[PDB]
Scaffold this motif. Structure first.
Motif: not given
Ligand SMILES: OC[C@H]1O[C@H](Sc2cccc(Br)c2)[C@H](O)[C@@H](n2cc(-c3cc(F)c(F)c(F)c3)nn2)[C@H]1O
Length: 138
Positions: A32-34, A46, A48, A50, A62, A69-70, A72, A125-126
């Protein structure tokens, strides 16, 4: 390299014509990466990747408001590859973030958080080696 998770302050928030560029290399066997464009505790955008969600590669986007969270938004075009260098460019346009990876347009994300000048941090991140993260006006 830079230490991940990395915080890139966005002084005075974002504005149309602001271009964020992230260079790095995906780790081997990445999961994962964000990227998190944040307004305080809220996540305006966001982004992300996967690498293995039920054996599929997908980018999930999202917004997080008051810790919730709303809806996606999902993109199955997946330009990242384990072990390989990448460039993410996020251009702020008036009504969306516009994302290109490795110079190819990938997706747009309509602004849900509308106080653009309060989106004043980007978290990264990730599962990457992060080479650089910067911004400029185009
Ligand atoms: O909707 C988007 C969210 O989905 C699920 S929560 C969920 C579940 C079902 C329906 C709905 Br709606 C939301 C996630 O857990 C959530 N996430 C991801 C990371 C994260 C952290 C890292 F440190 C990192 F490196 C990274 F890459 C990602 N933190 N939080 C976020 O992606």
């Amino acid at each position: 390299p830079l230490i991940v998770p990395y915080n890139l302050p966005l002084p005075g928030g974002v504005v149309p014509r602001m271009l964020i560029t992230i260079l790095g290399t995906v780790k081997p066997n990445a999961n994962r990466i964000a990227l998190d464009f944040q307004r305080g505790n809220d996540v305006a955008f966001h982004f992300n990747p996967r690498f293995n969600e039920n054996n599929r590669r997908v980018i999930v986007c999202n917004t997080k408001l008051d810790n919730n969270w709303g809806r996606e938004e999902r993109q199955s075009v997946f330009p990242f590859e384990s072990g390989k260098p990448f460039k993410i460019q996020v251009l702020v346009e008036p009504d969306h973030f516009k994302v290109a990876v490795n110079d190819a347009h990938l997706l747009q994300y309509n602004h849900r958080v509308k106080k653009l000048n309060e989106i004043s941090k980007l978290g990264i991140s990730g599962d990457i080696d992060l080479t650089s993260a910067s911004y400029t006006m185009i």
